[PDB]
Each structure stands twice: as structure tokens, then as C-alpha cells.
Ligand binder design. Sequence first.
Ligand SMILES: [N+]
Lengths: 74, 385
Amino acid sequence: QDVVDLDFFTQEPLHLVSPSFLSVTIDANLATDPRFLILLGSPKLRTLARGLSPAYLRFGGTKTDFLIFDPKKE
Amino acid sequence: KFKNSTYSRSSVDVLYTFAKCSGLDLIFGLNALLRTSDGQWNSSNAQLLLDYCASKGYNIDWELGNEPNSFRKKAGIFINGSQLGKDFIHLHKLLRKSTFKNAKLYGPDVGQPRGKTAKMLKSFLKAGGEVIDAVTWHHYYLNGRTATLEDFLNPDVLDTFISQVQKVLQVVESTRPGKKVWLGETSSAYGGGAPGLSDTFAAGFMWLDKLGLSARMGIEVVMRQVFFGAGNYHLVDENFDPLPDYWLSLLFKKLVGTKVLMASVQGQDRRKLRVYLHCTNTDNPRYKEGDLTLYAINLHNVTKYLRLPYPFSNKQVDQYLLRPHGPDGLLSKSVQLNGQTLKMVDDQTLPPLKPKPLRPGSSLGLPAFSYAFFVIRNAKVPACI
Ligand SMILES: [N+]
């Protein structure tokens, strides 16, 4: 009918994932937004990000290969 | 328009501070398209950045290049896998010479194999696999420009991910057996996501199913494109409002542990009822070693009732059922947990994520087009202890 029986395998784990299994990105293009410093300062955004700790934050994307570090830039 | 732009020390600082103050570990992709006249990676710019970050005491992991499989189309230059591997070895040496204590290096962040074979991934791993700490690849199910709600609910679409995973893992097994494999950038639909789709409750089936299958098939880390940004697949929009996939991810983080088990349906498998099983996240103060977290997707257009196998039947179960809130149905940008809309309490306070205790021995009700977590309490599973 609409009742489904489940089989479980619990003898030993098939795999171990990282404690950071569910991780997140910020696209490299965001660093071209002139508001970048202000946006990442948002208290709301920090609160939401902390909810996902532990996690990796990967900063990358297509613009990864079109961004240059300028150590003289203000 | 020219894609090339610059970024400052202040930009590096705010990104590092954002990661550090949120309890996240930053991975920074370096520019692989700075090349010498001899076809090698020119490390001059990266050296400046490494020196700066090391001077500041920043603990940062590194990547080099993004989707090198498309360099020929995006930049008019072809870098083969052997050469990319040599470039990664050069970067590895720079990291060893730095004052970074155990900086990790990940790569090559290649696009998914598709129908073809990951020839570039294989040559890269032969040449440079010894210096990377995990293999990164990317995946999207669909083109954001043409995806429809039907596609987001389609188990055939969901199943296409299985073959992509198998192809990557086979390449890694044949060149660097037991090297860790990570999804380094992944979401529902490419090209910025599907408008009015990738930011809705309906996006959750692809996201939860991808996590379930990744865990079950040996992917160690899955990096969601994006936490925050302008793309329709963002977890948080630029008004700083969380989308339904944010709350799905928060519940996953709180409930699902590191030990991957297995669950399956006894009957015929139409692939619309999809079930996954881990030990419960031990960091959750509500639960204890031995508890199990079942999570499940129901893509049928009618309610299904799950019966737990003995002895887990007649255990106390905590339900975390997610359903769309409001008149938009599956296309809603708001989501309810056990009938209560999820919203921040204020700008610095996440809401309580309260379980609904079920009557012991009751079958688990999963409405049409919904997904849920079920924590099986006092399961006393030795593999979880
Ligand atoms: N190659």
C-alpha cells in the first residue's frame, strides 16, 4: 500500500565523513563587489555562518583565475 | 568586459576574519592563469599573498586554479594535466618554505566528467597527486537557464549524480588509491542557479539527496555553491535572509553524524522514496552515543509511511519534518519545521529547532514532496558508540 518497510545495515560504518562534511563556498566574483568588506561584516550573516560550523569556507570560482593580489591597494 | 580585477590586503583580512569569527576554515583559490613564457605557472603574485598571510599568522588552506578543463575556452590557453601537476608541486614547495604550520593543498577543482572520461584529472593525479591532501571536483545537475520544477523533482535527474561520482572515484582509485575525494563546488544548476527554483523549498531534494549519496559513496566533504552571494542557489541572499536550503543545512549539521550507515526500502524501488542513515551527531546535546539519524525524501505525490526494522521499531523517535510555508507551495522561499515557520529570532539568534516526539512503534509519516530527519533515540547501536 503506502506503508514501506525499511532495512538497516548498522554492523559497522560504510564510510566516515569529515565533521566538516557539509561545507560551503563564497564565489570569487564576490570580491569584485565594492561592498565586499561591508557585506561580510553583517552580524546576521556571521550568525548564520556560525550555525554551519565546523565547515570549510572555500573562496573560489571562475574569477579565481582572473584575480590578482595588489599589496599596495587601499 | 575584462574579467581581471585586483583585491587588497583588507579584502583578505575581512574574508579571514569572517571565516575565523564564524568557526569556519578558509580555503583560498590561487590564480593558475599567471604563466611564464615557458608555459609554467608564474608564482610571483601568489608568493606576495602567501608572505602576507604568513606574516599575519593566518591559518589558510590553498587551491590553485578553478575548472582547468575550461581554460582553453575561457582564457584561450590550454594547460594539460601533467603541467598543472608540476605547478601544484611548485606551490607545495612554496607552502613548505612558508611559516604556515601544516597548510593543506587541494586540487584540481575540475568540472564533472559528464558523458566523457576524466582524462585531465587522471594525468593531473599521476603528475601532482602526491602533493594534494584531497581531490576536488565540481558538480551541477542541470543548466540553470532551462531547468524546470519537474526536473528538480525527478528521480532520474537525481540519479545522474551516481554515475558522475563513480567516474571520478574510478579515476582516483586507479592513480591515488585511498586519496580523499571532495566536491569542491556544487549545487543544483549552473549558470547561477535556476531563477525562482534554486532558492526554493523544491531545491532541497537535490541538496539533501546529494549529501546522502555523497556520504554513502565515499565523498568526504561537499562544498555548497554558495553560502552567500547573488546566485539563485545561495543559502543566504544579499538581504541576509536564509533560504530553505539554509535551514535544511542547519538541521543536517545538527543531526547527522560522521559515521555513514545504510538504509533501503524492502519493496520495489521506484527511487522516489530515498533513505539515508548515519549515526546521530554526537555534538548534539539532545542525543547520546548509539542514536541513529535517518533522513528521507518522498518524491511521490502521496504520503508514504516508513516502518522501522526491529529492534528500532518501538524506539522513541524525534521527527524533524520540513514542509514549505505559504501559498507558493514547493516554490516557497519559507519553510516550516513540524508546522512552525523557521525564522531568526533576531540578527544574532537562531531559532530553536525543536523535535516532535512520535509515539513509539508508529510508522513514520512522510507527506508528498517532503523530506525529514528522524532521530532514533536509545538505538544503542554499537557501531555508533
Ligand atoms: N597531460
